[PDB]
């Protein structure tokens, strides 16, 4: 599923991401835009043989099991394919664990490089929340 900007903002707000660990909704929408272009089916292979999955590009070395990242952990306790669903519940629940692990949203390279320090509220402007 390819979300619209406001559709995703509303879905994320319902799942508890607005101000989760102090990150306003605009941060999460900005990260999803540049991580996956709002596409739940996005996958990208990393150099080290791990793969990033879904709308927030969650990495198989630490967070989900894809059966092909040797010596990886599965801290979110899910198969990585669950992160590609049109239902973002699995992605959001895993993201809450990642952002709580000490490094905040710096875990997402695109957030660090393209959202951090910008006017992220622009990403929810005009939406009905």
Mark the binding-site residues for substrate, compressed into ranges: 101
> Phi and psi (nearest 5°) for 49?
90, -10
CB 93 → Cl ion: shortest distance, Å? Answer: 18
Question: Judged by CB under 5 A, which stretch of 3-11, 35-43, 62-70, 103-111 contacts Na ion?
Answer: 62-70
Task: Assess whether 18 carries a catalytic annotation.
Answer: no
Environment class of residue 13 by beta-carbon count within 10 Å: exposed (0-12), middle (13-18) or buried (19+)?
A: middle
Q: Does 36 bind Na ion (CB under 5 A)?
A: no
Q: Choose the catalytic residue: 7, 18, 48, 52.
A: 52
List the binding residues. Answer: 101
Using the 8-state DSSP alphabet, how is residue 2 labeled?
A: B
Catalytic residues: 35, 52
């Amino acid at each position: 599923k390819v979300f619209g900007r406001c559709e995703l903002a509303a879905a994320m707000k319902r799942h508890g991401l607005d101000n989760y660990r102090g990150y306003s909704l605009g941060n999460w929408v900005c990260a999803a835009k540049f991580e996956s272009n709002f596409n739940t089916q996005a996958t990208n292979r990393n150099t080290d043989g791990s793969t990033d999955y879904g709308i927030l590009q969650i990495n198989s070395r630490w967070w989900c099991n894809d059966g092909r990242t040797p010596g990886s952990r599965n801290l979110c306790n899910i198969p990585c394919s669950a992160l590609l669903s049109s239902d973002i519940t699995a992605s959001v629940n895993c993201a809450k664990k990642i952002v709580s692990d000490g490094n905040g949203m710096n875990a997402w390279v695109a957030w660090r490089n393209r959202c951090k320090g910008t006017d992220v509220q622009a990403w929810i402007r005009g939406c009905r929340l």
